[PDB]
Amino acid sequence: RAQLCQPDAHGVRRFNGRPCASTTRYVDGHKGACGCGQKGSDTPFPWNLQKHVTAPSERYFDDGGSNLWCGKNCGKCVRLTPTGGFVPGKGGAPPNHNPVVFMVTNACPINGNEEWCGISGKPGTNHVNSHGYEVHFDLQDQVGQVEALHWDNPEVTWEEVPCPGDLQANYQQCECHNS
Ligand SMILES: OC[C@H]1O[C@@H](O[C@H]2[C@H](O)[C@@H](O)[C@H](O)O[C@@H]2CO)[C@H](O)[C@@H](O)[C@@H]1O
Ligand SMILES: OC[C@H]1O[C@@H](O[C@H]2[C@H](O)[C@@H](O)[C@H](O)O[C@@H]2CO)[C@H](O)[C@@H](O)[C@@H]1O
């Protein structure tokens, strides 16, 4: 048993009652779906390639909707805490369980990401991905910031939290701020 969050009666994986999420890492260089770069260009601000930022699965990104530009949850922050688990063959156990806060600045669409981001309802509606998680967080890794955490697709618990001050200030520059 590599996955430590066990499915509840509705199939949703949890760990001591808290909901779990799967995670992956990505590199693509795009500005992304919250507009965190210069208007009209596909160029991200450097901080949006360097900091702890995430592309959640589509139905969380837009709070049940399908908009892939200025989703409802752009600019939210989530605290992810490793459980020690992982999907066998698709991750590993991390060296510690320090929690890390990430800011939503992009989206992981269902199309082309069915295994991890193919979840057909928002959290709380008992819809899960193919590995049993109600939400997925794809972590930006342009500058190796996920490797610096030594995270290889860890299973995590997840919660929304207020953003740290520096990430709030960064988000103010994104086009979707106040949309
Ligand atoms: O589709 C989500 C995300 O997947 C990333 O690839 C995963 C891959 O699915 C998994 O089998 C392997 O173990 O890990 C990699 C890295 O997390 C891919 O890099 C992303 O572009 C994609 O958005
Ligand atoms: O990059 C600006 C462009 O972002 C689009 O979102 C993409 C994002 O670029 C990509 O990194 C991620 O993997 O997929 C999302 C969703 O397809 C956004 O949809 C566009 O409106 C925007 O112009």
Q: Which domains does the chain have, with CATH numbers?
A: 1-179 (2.40.40.10)
**Dihedral of CA 97/99/105/109: which sign?**
positive
- What was the elucidation method? X-ray
138 is an active site residue? yes
Centre of ligand 2 to C-alpha 41, Å, is 12
Resolution (A): 1.5
Q: Which atom of ligand 1 has the smallest separation from the CA of 136?
A: 2
Q: Which atom of ligand 2 has the smallest separation from the CA of 35?
A: 2
Whole-number Å distance between alpha carbons of 37 and 40: 9
Instruction: Return the SS3 of 60.
Output: helix
Q: Which residues contact 156 (CB under 8 A, 6 or more apart)?
A: 20, 21, 22, 23, 80, 81, 82, 83, 137
42 is an active site residue? no
Cβ < 6 Å from ligand 1: which residues?
24-26, 90-91, 108, 113, 116-117, 138, 153
Instruction: Return the SS3 of 170.
Output: helix
Centre of ligand 2 to C-alpha 55, Å, is 10
DSSP state of 164: P
